[PDB]
């Protein structure tokens, strides 16, 4: 009843370095992922 969808893992780019301010490249990581889960497989407990 649980399924993970992994289109793309962590992928990191570097760019948009504004030389007019001496700022370094913006470093950005991005990921394409999804999860499928349901209450039809679980029982929650106390203590």
DSSP per residue over 12-27, as a string?
Answer: EEEE---GGGT---EE
Among 9, 16, 31, 37, binds a copy of itself (CB under 8 A): 16
- Whole-angstrom distance, CA of residue 47 vs CA of residue 43: 13
Q: Is 22 in the site for a copy of itself (CB under 8 A)?
A: yes
Q: Is 6 in the site for a copy of itself (CB under 8 A)?
A: no
Q: Is 46 in the site for a copy of itself (CB under 8 A)?
A: no
Cα angle for residues 4, 40, 3 (degrees, 5° grid): 10
Using CB under 8 A, list all residues that contact a copy of itself: 13-20, 22, 26, 28, 30
């Amino acid at each position: 009843g649980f399924k993970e969808l992994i289109k793309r893992d962590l992928t990191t780019e570097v760019g948009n370095a504004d030389l007019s301010k001496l700022v370094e490249n913006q470093i950005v990581g991005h990921c394409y992922r999804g999860a499928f889960a349901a209450v039809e497989e679980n029982v929650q407990e106390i203590s």
